[PDB]
Amino acid sequence: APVTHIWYFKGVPSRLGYLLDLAPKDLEKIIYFAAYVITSVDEEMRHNELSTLEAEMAVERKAVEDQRDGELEARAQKLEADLAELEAEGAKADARRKVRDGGEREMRQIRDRAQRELDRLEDIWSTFTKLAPKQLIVDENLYRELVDRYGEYFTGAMGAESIQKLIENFDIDAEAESLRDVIRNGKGQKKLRALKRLKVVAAFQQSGNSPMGMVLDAVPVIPPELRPMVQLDGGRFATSDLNDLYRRVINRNNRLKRLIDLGAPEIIVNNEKRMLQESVDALFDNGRRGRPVT
């Protein structure tokens, strides 16, 4: 499972944050699997049927409104019939108000649930029409609803591979030109941020390299002598803990491999990937962020 290099998403300035124009909060949430992210979107094909999409949105809203109206009318008729029955029986006004309040609260709940569905659809439509890369979705339920409903245009996954795909699909020269154009203008406040981002991007471009070096797939290990192995009177292992950290990383990778072979739902696999990322970050550096291992 691809991982990220601790020296970047935690560094100040965080090279990833500037290059990918993401706040540290969002980047760290993405890395440790806290919220999904929209990688790429074919906005054109959605625009070509944006009117048709709005039309189907309207008709589904009409259908939900229609079932809502059916329920409201049925319950209002039931309540009115109950009130007429109670009047015929000549019961006290206390019973009248009790039944009336019960029915009114039931209808308020029905309308509130209908408005729940309506605002859910409105959020879906807003986040669908008003959608672009680098967007976040904190709640998993909303993302599940999006993919189930509109799983055609935008592809979004949470994890290091997400960043890798985003950066490799991303281009540098266009952003460099846009930042240069912004700098050519004024507005010091945003101009300084533009200057910093342009500096980073120009360094990337001049380096002749690619940002893909910020997501690792194969960590190396130093020779054995550099981590000398020591035998005590009882032959105990008390040498540099480098062996301990490599043990942890290898053990967790093998657990990942075995688990993915066996098959299991997304929750366990994602948790396990997070644990692996934690171990690699610890090995490249202990105590950089969070509680150091002891």
Partner: peptide, 10 residues
């Protein structure tokens, strides 16, 4: 540490 340290004898 993934830092490709070349020599550039040239």
């Amino acid at each position: 540490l993934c830092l490709n340290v070349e020599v550039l004898s040239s």
